[PDB]
UniProtKB/Swiss-Prot annotation:
Function: Cysteine protease that cleaves viral polyprotein and specific host proteins. It is responsible for the autocatalytic cleavage between the P1 and P2 regions, which is the first cleavage occurring in the polyprotein. Also cleaves the host translation initiation factor EIF4G1, in order to shut down the capped cellular mRNA translation. Inhibits the host nucleus-cytoplasm protein and RNA trafficking by cleaving host members of the nuclear pores. Counteracts stress granule formation probably by antagonizing its assembly or promoting its dissassembly.
Organism name: Coxsackievirus A16 (strain G-10)
Catalytic site positions: H15, D33, C104
Catalytic reactions on record: Selective cleavage of Tyr-|-Gly bond in the picornavirus polyprotein
Source species, domain of life: Viruses
Protein name as catalogued: Protease 2A
């Protein structure tokens, strides 16, 4: 589980979005596993605006933050998980590390702020759904 709270936006994995998220929908994209809903309270997370390929992510299944190198956001084939079929996922960044389904929503951060949230796992890789291209998160 986990979310990004920026301005009046809540960023979650689409597959974990709640009824309240869908009833307050701003934007969703299945191919990215992202959903954004509107909040009544202002959020304080800073979104990274950068092309960093190093940062730190939270791994709930190890209660640990790991420093990792990660690939640039790309269209990648993801093998079947308990929450998605085998399919292509867009704007996905891979690192070498541990990821289980319950780790979805863990923050990846760099020196510029929030890069993305854990979205995929398995075969010793962790996949992160990038949010750095969503510049509208910072305004309105
Ligand atoms: Zn950065």
């Amino acid at each position: 589980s986990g979310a990004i709270y920026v301005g009046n936006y809540r960023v979650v994995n689409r597959h974990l979005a709640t009824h309240n998220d869908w009833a307050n929908l701003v934007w969703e994209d299945s191919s990215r596993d992202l959903l954004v809903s509107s909040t009544t309270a202002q959020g304080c997370d800073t979104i990274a605006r950068c092309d960093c390929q190093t940062g730190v992510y939270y791994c709930s299944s190890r209660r640990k933050h790991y420093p990792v190198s990660f690939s640039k956001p790309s269209l990648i084939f993801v093998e079947a998980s308990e929450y998605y079929p085998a399919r292509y996922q867009s704007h996905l960044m891979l690192a070498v590390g541990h990821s289980e389904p319950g780790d979805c929503g863990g923050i990846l951060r760099c020196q510029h702020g929030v890069v993305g949230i854990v979205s995929t796992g398995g075969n010793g890789l962790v996949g992160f759904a990038d949010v750095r291209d969503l510049l509208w998160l910072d305004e309105e």
